[PDB]
Amino acid sequence: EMQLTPFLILLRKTLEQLQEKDTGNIFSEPVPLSEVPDYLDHIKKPMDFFTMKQNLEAYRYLNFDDFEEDFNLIVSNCLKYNAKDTIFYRAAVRLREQGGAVLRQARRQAEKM
Ligand SMILES: CCc1nnc2cc(C)c3ccc(OC)cc3n12
């Protein structure tokens, strides 16, 4: 029950804030299927920040949950595919942790709309 333009402005800002937490840029683009030939074997829906940006601008995120769901996919896919003693796994835990406050604050603002 809100206006489209301010909401998308809020999602854009939120997405940039989330991306800022990924300092190694390991989640910026789709996992390279050419480099990881077995990836799709147990990852049913790959996700990444570039794809999220495309979805946002394609008006595919019209509520906060659908945005947050794809962010959570970035994290959960990474935890699933990689062993716990890897940099990738711990980077996903860190993103989940730091992304948490970013999402909570952004949703607060959305609920004012
Ligand atoms: C989030 C990126 C990712 N998640 N799991 C893996 C596993 C692998 C193997 C992987 C390899 C290269 C790479 O460049 C971004 C990302 C990779 N990766």
**Residue ranges of the domains in the chain?**
1-113
CB within 6 Å of ligand 1 — which residues?
Answer: 26-27, 31-32, 35-36, 78, 81-82, 88
Q: Which of 88, 89, 93 to mutate to test the pocket of ligand 1 (most atoms within 8 A of CB)?
A: 88
Architecture of domain 1-113: Up-down Bundle (1.20)
- For the chain, the straight-line distance linking the first and the last C-alpha, in angstroms and rounded, comes to 8
Q: CB within 8 A of 76, min separation 6: which ones?
A: 92
Measure the CA–CA gap between 20 and 15, rounded to whole angstroms.
9
Distance 3 CA to ligand 1 centre (A): 37
Q: Three-state SS for 54?
A: helix
Q: Which atom of ligand 1 is nearest to the CA of 74?
A: 1
Resolution of the structure in the document, Å: 1.6
**Paired tokens of 44:** 């049913």
